[PDB]
Amino acid sequence: ITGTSTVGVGRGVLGDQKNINTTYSTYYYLQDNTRGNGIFTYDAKYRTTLPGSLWADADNQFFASYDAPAVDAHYYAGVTYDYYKNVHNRLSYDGNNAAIRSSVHYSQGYNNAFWNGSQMVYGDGDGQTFIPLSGGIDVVAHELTHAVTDYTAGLIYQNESGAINEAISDIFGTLVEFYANKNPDWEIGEDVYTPGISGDSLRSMSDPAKYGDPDHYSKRYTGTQDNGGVHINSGIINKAAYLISQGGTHYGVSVVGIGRDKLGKIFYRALTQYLTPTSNFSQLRAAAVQSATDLYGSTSQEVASVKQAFDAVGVK
Ligand SMILES: [Ca+2]
Ligand SMILES: [Ca+2]
Ligand SMILES: [Ca+2]
Ligand SMILES: [Ca+2]
Ligand SMILES: [Zn+2]
Question: What distance in angstroms lies between residue 301's CA and the mean position of ligand 3's atoms?
Answer: 27
Of the candidates 95, 113, 94, which has an alpha carbon nearest to the alpha carbon of residue 104?
A: 113
CB atoms within 10 A of CB 135: 28
3-state secondary structure of 218: helix
DSSP 71-113: HHHHHHHHHHHHHHHHHH---TTTSS-PPEEEEEEESSS---E
250 as an active site residue: the answer is: no
Resolution of the coordinates in A? 2.0
Say if CB 125 and CB 111 are below 8 A apart.
Answer: yes
143 as an active site residue: the answer is: yes
Query: On the CB side of 165, how many CA atoms lie within 13 Å of its CA?
Result: 29
Residues contributing to the annotated binding site: 57, 59, 61, 138, 142, 146, 166, 177, 183, 185, 187, 190, 193-194, 197, 200
Say if CB 175 and CB 80 are below 8 A apart.
Answer: no
User: Distances in Å between the alpha carbon of 53 and those of 7, 129, 190, 234?
Assistant: 20, 27, 29, 35
Question: What distance in angstroms lies between residue 9's CA and the mean position of ligand 1's atoms?
Answer: 9
Q: Extract the runs of DSSP E, i.e. beta strands, from the chain.
A: 4-11, 17-25, 27-29, 31-32, 39-43, 53-54, 56-57, 61-62, 100-106, 113-115, 120-123, 187-188, 203-204, 248-250, 253-255
Number of the ligand closest to the Cα of 182: 2
Domains of the chain: residue spans and CATH: 6-154 (3.10.170.10), 155-315 (1.10.390.10)
Strand partners, 5: 23
User: d(Cα 50, Cα 59) in Å, to the nearest integer?
Assistant: 25
Residues contributing to the annotated binding site for Zn(2+): 142, 146, 166
Number of the ligand closest to the Cα of 63: 1
The set of residues, in sequence order, having a beta carbon less than 8 Å from that of 15 and lying 6+ positions away, is: none
User: d(Cα 247, Cα 184) in Å, to the nearest integer?
Assistant: 18
Residues in the chain, total? 316
Question: What distance in angstroms lies between residue 143's CA and the mean position of ligand 5's atoms?
Answer: 6
User: Distances in Å between the alpha carbon of 77 and those of 45, 88, 240, 297?
Assistant: 20, 16, 27, 34
User: d(Cα 3, Cα 108) in Å, to the nearest integer?
Assistant: 32
The residues whose Cβ lies within 5 A of ligand 1, an ion, are: 57, 59, 61
What is the signed CA dihedral for 277, 40, 189, 110, rounded to 10 degrees? -90
Strand partners, 233: none
